[PDB]
Every structure is written in structure tokens, then in C-alpha cells.
Ligand SMILES: Nc1ncnc2c1ncn2[C@@H]1O[C@H](COP(=O)(O)OP(=O)(O)O)[C@@H](O)[C@H]1O
Ligand SMILES: Nc1ncnc2c1ncn2[C@@H]1O[C@H](COP(=O)(O)OP(=O)(O)O)[C@@H](O)[C@H]1O
Ligand code: SF4
């Protein structure tokens with residue numbers, strides 16, 4: 001069966017960058033990949049297709065919320081190097097639960113057996129809250145990965161996401177793999193946090209010109225025109241993908257009481 | 269009764285900064301003020317009390333979720349110049365609806381008539397999603413204020429918050445006041461968005477070193493050592509408070525489709 005990953009973190013921290021470049025890396029390693037955007041900011045798969053594909057909510061609206069009329073070709077799109085792409089989108093105005101479209105997406109994935117017949121599945125998920133449809137990927141994932149920077153807000157979110165994932169531990173198989181420290185020069189604060197919680201930093205991606213430009217060219221680092229700066233960034237994504245494919249030794253971390261994050265990071 | 273304001277926006281954009289300084293401004297203008305933090309990052313009222321006060325979830329836990337047993341003295345705290353402070357906190361992550369504690373907090377406020385016997389109430393609310401308990405303050409607010417900057421993510425969040433507020437406006441008295449452009453030199457993108465949507469910029473707060481420092485020092489701008497910028501910043505918070513108190517003309521904005529925000533801001 002597929003190895004399934006769920007990527008969480010605060011808004012704007014690099015979830016889609018990390019997910020898309022990981023999907024591209026896995027494809028380069030010879031794996032069949034499916035990436036599912038689970039975020040009301042519906043550009044998860046943008047750099048894989050070079051476009052904003054029709055979203056699950058778009059196509060649901062088109063069949064007047066009779067999802068039984070949909071076929072995979074309506075909402076699953078081929079992107080870079082054969083990476084398959086689904087984009088949930090966000091719920092329309094007034095919608096009760098903010099996760100509803102992610103819930104509808106995960107329903108369709110299971111009904112169409114789309115987690116089968118592939119090697120790697122990556123869910124790219126809003127993590128400012130983890131509940132309802134935003135928690136649905138956890139029922140399917142083997143490993144959860146948190147994207148973080150060194151700032152207070154991203155670490156505080158990471159701590160809450162750790163708690164959310166561990167709260168599922170008796171019901172789901174998903175376990176935490178660790179974090180990707182992203183868009184920062186070094187990792188002092190992330191490492192301080194990891195030491196306190198026995199958590200693991202899986203990778204460090206600096207704030208790279210190559211990456212910012214890739215999004216502006218509507219491409220992944222791997223689809224980009226070759227230059228030197230691209231090569232180093234590519235290598236770290238390949239390394240990270242290799243480690244996740246191979247599997248890591250387990251961690252058994254803990255979340256801190258939320259109050260104690262303020263203390264730990266000098267913000268009380 | 270009290271004039272009730274609800275402040276929404278993406279995580280880390282300046283909601284608690286705007287709320288706390290607005291509360292301090294109203295207090296200086298001679299108004300009785302209640303600020304309610306409605307955010308899992310539970311430092312909304314930190315700079316008013318100079319400390320992380322006990323949260324509603326703290327005290328709910330202690331009484332084993334029998335809110336019956338609580339009195340206002342258990343969860344309402346005195347801060348700067350008599351500004352009164354409540355801090356919701358968040359629920360244990362991964363166990364239920366992320367909005368649960370905000371929902372319980374709103375119930376407690378109504379139970380104890382805490383909206384009825386003050387002049388100004390300010391809810392400071394997570395707005396990366398607007399659903400469940402996070403939408404509950406909109407059932408009591410007179411005016412909703414969105415904090416934003418010129419960046420894509422905060423404007424995109426503001427767009428979705430507009431739609432959420434207007435959905436509540438069908439069944440509740442709340443209307444949109446407009447946005448506070450925060451931590452930016454100018455308001456070019458914010459104004460482009462406002463022009464397209466018939467929204468309104470109510471105020472603009474530049475990125476000020478004194479504001480960032482104030483959070484570290486655990487106080488509001490109104491207690492910061494004086495200088496040209498700090499005086500201007502105070503004056504702007506006063507002007508905003510004055511405008512909200514006297515009231516502005518009713519506006520009738522429209523949110524855009526998410527896809528159209530990518531187009532408008534050049535991110536597709
Ligand atoms: N390591 C990095 N170096 C440079 N830019 C980055 C990096 N990670 C993310 N970005 C940029 O930051 C912005 C937000 O990243 P994104 O992956 O879309 O965040 P999220 O999916 O968590 O909201 C994008 O413009 C993206 O290109
Ligand atoms: N106008 C501003 N100038 C300088 N710093 C600001 C400004 N607004 C907010 N900040 C800083 O940004 C950080 C996050 O602000 P905060 O109000 O806590 O955001 P939110 O409540 O939206 O999560 C804080 O460290 C705060 O001091
Ligand atoms: S479960 Fe989560 S996403 Fe759904 S209403 Fe509650 S806070 Fe919103």
C-alpha cells in the first residue's frame with residue numbers, strides 16, 4: 001500500500017512548498033505520487049500543475065452537491081513528472097464547519113479508492129486548527145510532519161499540532177515523524193523546542209531565492225530550469241524524501257502545556 | 269448597553285496588538301472596557317494585565333466542566349487603568365471542536381451579564397477559520413473589524429472573514445466596520461482590495477519598534493516611553509476608538525471568489 005504523509009503547520013509557514021517539492025522529489029525517486037491540498041487557500045498543488053486546478057468544491061458546486069455524479073477525471077489532475085493532484089478548496093460562505101470541504105474530499109478519495117494503486121500520498125493540511133475535516137487526513141496517514149520556522153507563532157502552533165496528533169494515538173496508526181524547519185537561516189529556537197519535547201528536526205530548508213522564484217514561475221524546484229542554487233535545495237528535498245521512504249526510528253515526543261511555551265521561548 | 273466589537277484576521281497579523289491598544293485607548297477616553305481573548309494562543313490580554321492570567325479553560329477544567337460553579341471573579345481580571353480582561357484559551361488539541369472554549373466563554377459572558385454592564389466590549393478572535401465557537405462572538409457584536417496587512421495571506425483571510433461576517437448578518441445584528449491595515453508602511457494592496465470589494469480601511473498602523481517592544485515589556489503603547497512615533501501611534505488608536513464610538517456610515521462590501529483573489533493580487 002501507499003506510504004501516507006500529512007503535513008501540518010501554521011498558515012503561510014511553507015506547507016505547500018514542502019509538500020510539493022517532496023512530491024516532486026518522490027517522483028524523481030521513481031515513486032507514484034498523489035498530493036491532496038486540504039486548505040481553504042487552495043494553491044497546494046499550484047506548482048505541480050502550473051495552474052490553480054478545479055477544486056473539489058468547484059466541481060461539487062457544478063453537480064449541485066450530488067458528489068455521486070463525479071468521476072476521478074473531474075477532480076484528479078496530472079502534474080509534474082506524473083504527480084497526481086487534488087485540491088480541496090474551502091467551504092462557501094456560511095458553511096458551518098470550516099473543515100467541511102476537506103471532509104468531502106477525503107470521502108471522494110476513499111469512494112474512488114485513490115489511496116490505493118499509488119506509492120506515496122501527501123496531504124497538505126491547514127493546521128491553525130486541527131479538527132473536523134482538517135483532522136481527517138490523520139485517519140489515513142502513516143506519518144505526520146510539521147512545518148515550522150523559529151518564530152514564536154510557528155512553534156506554538158507546532159506544539160498544539162503535536163498534541164492533536166497524539167490525541168489520536170489509540171484510534172489511528174499515524175505517528176509523528178518530526179518537523180521541517182523552513183525559511184529560516186538557522187534553527188536555534190526549533191532545536192530548543194525539540195530538546196524539551198524529545199521531538200525531531202527532519203530537515204532544514206533555508207530562506208532560498210531559488211524557492212521563492214519557483215512559486216513565481218509556477219514550478220517546483222525540480223521542474224525549474226537548472227542552475228546551481230536549485231541543485232542544493234533539490235538535494236535536501238531528495239534527502240528528506242529518501243529518509244521518509246526508508247522510514248525512521250521512532251520518536252516518542254510530548255507536547256508542553258500551552259502556557260509553558262510562552263515560558264520556554266521567553267514570551268511570558 | 270455596551271458597544272461590542274469583534275476583531276478577526278489571520279494568525280500573527282496583529283489582532284491582540286490592535287485589540288489591546290484599542291482597549292487602552294477607550295479606557296483613556298473614559299470608557300469602561302472588557303476585552304475577551306478568543307484564541308488558542310492565549311496572550312490576547314497579556315499586555316493589559318502584564319501577565320498570562322488564568323484562562324476560561326483553566327478554570328473550567330478545575331470545576332470539571334460545571335460552569336455553574338464559576339463566578340466572574342474566577343475568570344475576569346483587572347488590567348491597565350481598570351480595563352477588564354478575560355482569556356478563553358483553547359481546548360486540549362485533537363479531542364473536539366477547536367472553537368469549544370470560545371463557545372463556552374461567550375455563554376459565560378452572557379450568563380453573568382458581562383456584555384450588559386460596560387461601555388465597550390472587544391472580542392479578539394482567531395480568524396484563520398470562522399466556524400463553531402470562533403463564530404460565536406459574531407452573534408453578539410455590533411461591528412466586526414478585520415486586521416490585515418498588504419501581503420497575500422492576510423488579504424485572502426480578510427476576504428473569507430468578510431463572507432463569514434455577512435453570513436451571520438442574515439440572522440444577527442453584526443455588520444462590518446472595515447479593516448485595520450497593520451504593520452505596513454503603506455496600504456497599496458489593502459486599498460486595491462478595498463476598492464474592488466467596496467470595503468473600508470478604518471485605520472492604518474505602521475510597523476513600529478515600540479509596539480514590538482511593548483509586547484516583550486508586557487504593556488500597551490499607552491505606557492511606553494514617549495517619542496514622535498509612539499505619540500502618533502497612540503493618536504491613531506485614539507482616533508480609531510473615537511470613530512468606532514461615534515460610528516461610521518453603514519457599508520455594503522462583497523467578498524470575491526477565492527480564485528479571484530489569486531488573480532487580483534497576481535498570485536495565479
Ligand atoms: N524555504 C523557503 N524559502 C523561500 N521562500 C519560501 C520558503 N518556503 C516557503 N516560501 C514562500 O513562502 C510563501 C508561503 O509558502 P507556502 O508553502 O505557500 O505556505 P503554506 O502552504 O504553509 O501557507 C510562498 O510565497 C513560498 O514560495
Ligand atoms: N504595527 C505593528 N508594529 C510592530 N509590531 C507589531 C505590529 N502589530 C503587531 N506587531 C507584533 O507582531 C507580533 C504578533 O502580533 P499579535 O498582535 O500577537 O498577533 P495576533 O494576535 O494576530 O496573533 C507581536 O510580537 C506584535 O508585537
Ligand atoms: S471542528 Fe474545527 S473546523 Fe469545524 S467548526 Fe469546529 S473549529 Fe471550525
Ligand SMILES: [Mg+2]
Pocket residue numbers: 015016017039041043044124
Ligand atoms: Mg499552502
Ligand SMILES: [Mg+2]
Pocket residue numbers: 283284285307309311312392
Ligand atoms: Mg492574538
